[PDB]
């Protein structure tokens, strides 16, 4: 089979500058002088969107920012300049040989300005306590970069076990990220202690954003 | 263009499942069609292709002999018969219009239908209202312990789209957990009703938890 190897698994570029994504094929994707390589743009919750067909042909409706070039085995997708709504995962695909194969994809993220997280701690729901469980949620909304740190503190202690995290995809408008840290415990252990803390260490501030509550 | 695929469901390994795709707005009979899926790892994989008349069918070796792409040009519907299902078949199946005269790649995709191939049983989710230290106000919703995916979490029936961050479900040993934060103004809550809503199709669950202050 023909394997498609895409350069930059992920690429971070500033708004207003160009991006270059490569796609190398293990075998020629050419036939009859035409290159059967295709480029797609996939945003979260939506199916791939055709940007360029046959290496260099711009699909109608697609802004001129996008352009394609290459032949035989080496291909390139160029976004110039990169706009805020361009954040997505780009895939290359060959249709020269059966079976048709796709590249692993290249996630494009915008180098937006630094922004501190908006931490919000949420104690266990009364309804959840009836089930014998106790999850303390902590939302860290709108921040950049993606790399952040959450350290849970139960009665001053740094609880390491039972933390289920989840990051959202970079927002298409403000170019920020959001994170949810969840410390899951049993109701018995939850009632054993009193103070629950959710600390957020980020590059925007030396002092971590502490958010806690006294159980009552 | 306008491809609505259906039939996605949780099936046991080695089982069978058939997918459908309603094509409307164009002359379906003249177009070559295809099925393309996307694994949980976000990997795009071509599944099958069938000619306008249905005489020519193409399938990758990992799918050939188990999957069968066919179509009904009378009612304009594309089909995908899946048999001897494997764990690797777990993916989002997109109905794609392949071509007419030229190879223009995959120009029109459907919104997809999720097919989950697992031995785990269907478990209904537990929706929990997340009042802040209820006392701009941020609120939250906890959908814990459910299988399989997905769930449709919405705020105020969709009328509340501002400041909503619905986080990706994380798998905690055969059971997913999804969260969502809605950030509104102090004059909007608890003054107005903000209802933490959820819906799980696999279990026929439809829970509406109202965010009540603490």
């Amino acid at each position: 089979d023909i394997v498609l190897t895409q350069s930059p698994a992920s690429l971070a570029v500033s708004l207003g500058q160009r991006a270059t994504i490569s796609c190398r094929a293990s075998e020629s994707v050419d036939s009859y002088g035409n290159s059967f390589m295709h480029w797609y743009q996939q945003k979260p919750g939506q199916p791939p969107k055709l940007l360029i067909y046959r290496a260099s042909n711009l699909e109608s409706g697609i802004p001129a920012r996008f352009s394609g070039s290459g032949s035989r085995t080496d291909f390139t997708l160029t976004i110039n300049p990169v706009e805020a709504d361009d954040v997505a995962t780009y895939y290359c695909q060959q249709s020269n040989e059966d079976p048709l194969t796709f590249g692993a994809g290249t996630k494009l993220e915008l180098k937006r300005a630094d922004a501190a997280p908006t931490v919000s701690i949420f104690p266990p729901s009364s309804e959840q306590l009836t089930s014998g469980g106790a999850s303390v949620v902590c939302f860290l909304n709108n921040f950049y970069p993606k790399d952040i740190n959450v350290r849970w503190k139960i009665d001053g202690s740094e609880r390491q076990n039972g933390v289920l995290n989840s990051w959202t995809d970079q927002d298409s408008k403000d170019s920020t990220y959001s994170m949810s840290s969840t410390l899951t415990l049993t109701k018995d252990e939850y009632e054993r202690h009193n103070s629950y803390t959710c600390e957020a260490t980020h590059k925007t501030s030396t002092s971590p954003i502490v958010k806690s509550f006294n159980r009552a | 263009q306008m491809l609505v695929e259906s039939g996605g469901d949780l099936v046991k390994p080695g089982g069978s499942l058939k997918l459908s795709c309603a094509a409307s707005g164009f002359t379906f009979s003249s177009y070559t069609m295809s099925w393309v899926r996307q694994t949980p790892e976000k990997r795009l994989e071509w599944v099958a292709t069938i000619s306008s008349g249905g005489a020519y069918t193409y399938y990758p070796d990992s799918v050939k002999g188990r999957f069968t792409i066919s179509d009904d040009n009378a009612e304009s519907t594309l089909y995908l018969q899946m048999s001897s299902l494997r764990s690797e078949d777990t993916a989002m199946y997109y109905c794609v219009r392949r071509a007419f005269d030229s190879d223009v790649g995959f120009a029109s995709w459907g919104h997809r239908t999720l097919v989950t191939v697992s031995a785990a049983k269907t478990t209904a989710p537990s929706v929990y209202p997340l009042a802040p230290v209820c006392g701009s106000v941020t609120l939250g919703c906890l959908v814990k312990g459910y299988f399989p995916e997905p769930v449709t979490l919405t705020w105020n029936s969709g009328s509340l789209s501002s400041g909503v961050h619905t986080f990706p479900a994380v798998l905690q040993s055969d059971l997913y957990t999804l969260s969502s934060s809605v950030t509104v103004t102090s004059s909007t809550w608890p003054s107005q009703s903000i209802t933490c809503n959820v819906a799980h199709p696999a279990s026929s669950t439809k829970v509406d938890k109202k965010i009540e202050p603490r």
């Binding site: 036939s31 009859y32 249709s95 059966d98 | 070559t32 071509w46 292709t49 000619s51 190879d103």
Partner: peptide, 13 residues
């Protein structure tokens, strides 16, 4: 030709 003879559109005549 805008279609390949080794692909999934080889029937496309």
């Amino acid at each position: 030709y805008t279609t390949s003879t080794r692909g999934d559109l080889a029937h496309v005549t």
